[PDB]
Amino acid sequence: ELIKENMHMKLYMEGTVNNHHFKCTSEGEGKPYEGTQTMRIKVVEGGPLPFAFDILATSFSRTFINHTQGIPDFWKQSFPEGFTWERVTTYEDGGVLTATQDTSLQDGCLIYNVKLRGVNFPSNGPVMQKKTLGWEAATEMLYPADGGLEGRGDMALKLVGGGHLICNLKTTYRSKNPAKNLKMPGVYFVDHRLERIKEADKETYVEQHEVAVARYCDLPSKL
Numbered sequence: 001e002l003i004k005e006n007m008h009m010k011l012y013m014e015g016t017v018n019n020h021h022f023k024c025t026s027e028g029e030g031k032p033y034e035g036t037q038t039m040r041i042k043v044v045e046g047g048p049l050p051f052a053f054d055i056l057a058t059s060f061s062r063t064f065i066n067h068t069q070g071i072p073d074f075w076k077q078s079f080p081e082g083f084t085w086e087r088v089t090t091y092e093d094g095g096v097l098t099a100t101q102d103t104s105l106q107d108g109c110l111i112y113n114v115k116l117r118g119v120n121f122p123s124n125g126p127v128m129q130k131k132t133l134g135w136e137a138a139t140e141m142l143y144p145a146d147g148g149l150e151g152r153g154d155m156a157l158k159l160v161g162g163g164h165l166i167c168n169l170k171t172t173y174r175s176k177n178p179a180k181n182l183k184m185p186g187v188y189f190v191d192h193r194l195e196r197i198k199e200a201d202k203e204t205y206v207e208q209h210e211v212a213v214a215r216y217c218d219l220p221s222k223l
Contacts, residue, residue, distance in 0.1 A: 001079070002079045002080050002105060002108075003032050003063060003076050003079060003105075004032075004108070005031060005032070005033060006029060006030070006031055007029060007030060007031075007032055007063065007064075007108075007109075007110055008027070008028070008029040008108075008109050008110065009026075009027065009028055009029060009030075009037075009039075009061065009063075009109065009110035009111070009112060010025075010026075010027050010109055010110070010111050010112070011024075011025060011026040011027070011039070011041075011060055011111070011112035011113075011114065012024075012025055012112065012113050012114065013025070013026075013056070013059065013060065013112075013113075013114040013115075013116070014114070014115055014116075015056075015099075015114075015115065015116035015117060015118065016116075016117055016118070017049075017051050017055070017097070017116075017117075017118030017119075017121065018051065018118060018119060018120075018121050018123075018128060020046060020049070020050055020051065021045070021046050022043055022045050022046030022047065022049060023043070023044050023045035023046065024041055024042065024043050024044065024056070024060075025041070025042055025044055026039045026040055026041035026042065026060055027039070027040055028040050030061075030064045031064070032063050032064050032065075032076065033066060033067075034064075034066055035064060035065050035066030035211055035212045035213045035214075036064065036066075036209075036210070036211050037061055037064040037209065037210055038197070038207065038208070038209045039060050039061070039207070039208045039209070039210075040205075040206075040207050041060060041205065041206045041207070041208060042204065042205050042206075043203070043204040043205075047201075047202070047204040048201065048202035048203065048204050049202075049203060049204075050128070050130075051118075051121065051127055051128050051130065052126065052127045052128075052130045052131075052132040052157075053199070053203040053206055054127075054132045054133075054134060054135065054157055055089075055095070055097060055118065055121075055127055055157075056116075057135060057194055057196075057208060058087075058089070058135075058155070058169070058194065059087075059099045059101065059114050059116055060112070060114070060208065061110075061112065061210065062074075062075040062083070062085065062103065062173065063075050063076060063103065063110055064210070064212060065190055065212040065213065065214050066212065066213045066214065067214045068213060068214060068215050069215065069216060071185050071188055071214045071215070071216070072182070072183040072184065072185045073214075074148070074149050074173060074175070074182070074184075074185065075103075075173070077175070077180075077182060077183070078103075078175040078176060078177065078180070079105050080105055081175070081176035081177040081180070082102070082103045082104040082105055082176050083103050083148075083173060083174060083175050083176055084100065084101060084102050084103065084173075084174050084176065085100070085101045085103075085171055085172065085173045085174070086098070086099070086100045086101075086171065086172050087099045087100075087169055087170060087171040087172075088169075088170050089167050089168070089169050089170075090167055090168045090170075091121070091125075091127065091165060091166070091167040092165060092166045092167065092168075093121075093122055093125050093165060094120050094121070094122055094125075095118065095119075095120055095121035095122070095125065095127055095167070096118070096119055096120050097116060097117070097118040097119075098116060098117050098118075099114060099115070099116040099117075100114065100115050100116070101113065101114045102114075125165075126157075126159050126160075126165055127165075130203075131159060131160045131161075132157050132158060132159060132160070132165070133158040133159065133160055134157075134158050134195065134196055135155055135156065135157055135158070135194050135195075136155070136156040136157075136158065136164070137191070137192065137193045138153055138154070138155045138156070138191075138192050138193075138194075139153055139189055139190070139191050139192070140152065140153035140169070140171075140189065140190045140192060141153055141187070141188075141189055142185070142187070142188055142189065142190060143186075143187045143188075144184045144185070144186075145172075146172070147172055147174045148172065148173050148174040148175055149172075149173045149184075149185075150170070150171060150172050150173070151169065151170070151171040151173065151190070152168075152169065152170055152171075153168075153169055154166055154167065154168050154169070155167055155169060186216075188214060188215065188216055188217075189214065189215050189216070189217065190212055190213065190214050190215075191212065191213050191215065192210065192211070192212045193210065193211045193212075194208065194209070194210045195208070195209050195210070196208055196209075197209050
């Protein structure tokens with residue numbers, strides 16, 4: 001209702017990965033009911049990053065998920081209070097990245113605040129050595145649990161020369177107005193495709209774009 005067919009977003013991000021501190025800001029906009037959005041991102045502190053930008057990718061936008069087939073939109077329903085999420089992402093080579101996000105709506109702009117911490121990335125692994133080429137498409141599984149909804153899913157990070165490094169994502173999404181009576185969904189899925197459209201100055205400017213669609217499992221249930 002407060003989320004209009006086209007919405008702009010502003011974002012602030014602070015983190016430390018493997019003792020390196022940085023800050024990012026970004027702005028962009030999208031079409032919340034299409035499930036599309038574009039972000040223009042600048043590393044404004046600690047640039048250039050001595051680690052692959054790719055690991056920050058998923059920490060810049062849950063409002064912009066096309067809900068098909070009438071799945072209740074956990075995130076769009078949380079306005080005007082908005083929502084938060086917290087994630088732990090675990091790379092199969094030991095890197096661990098925790099991230100917290102607050103999402104709000106002020107004067108019709110979507111505003112994101114992110115804090116994150118990355119530790120234990122191997123010094124000679126592809127993340128610290130920046131040998132990564134973007135994310136494969138991915139599906140996330142979502143389901144009602146404790147505070148709100150949890151998401152689970154793996155993502156494949158592309159490696160130069162081919163190969164992938166896998167990580168696993170565990171997310172808790174919380175509505176800020178807990179009192180608000182939600183229509184909660186059952187168990188479902190969000191298909192995500194997140195792509196880097198452009199970059200500059202050693203990944204110190206990055207244009208990222210994402211399509212995300214919510215769906216049930218479209219298979220017969222002999223039960």
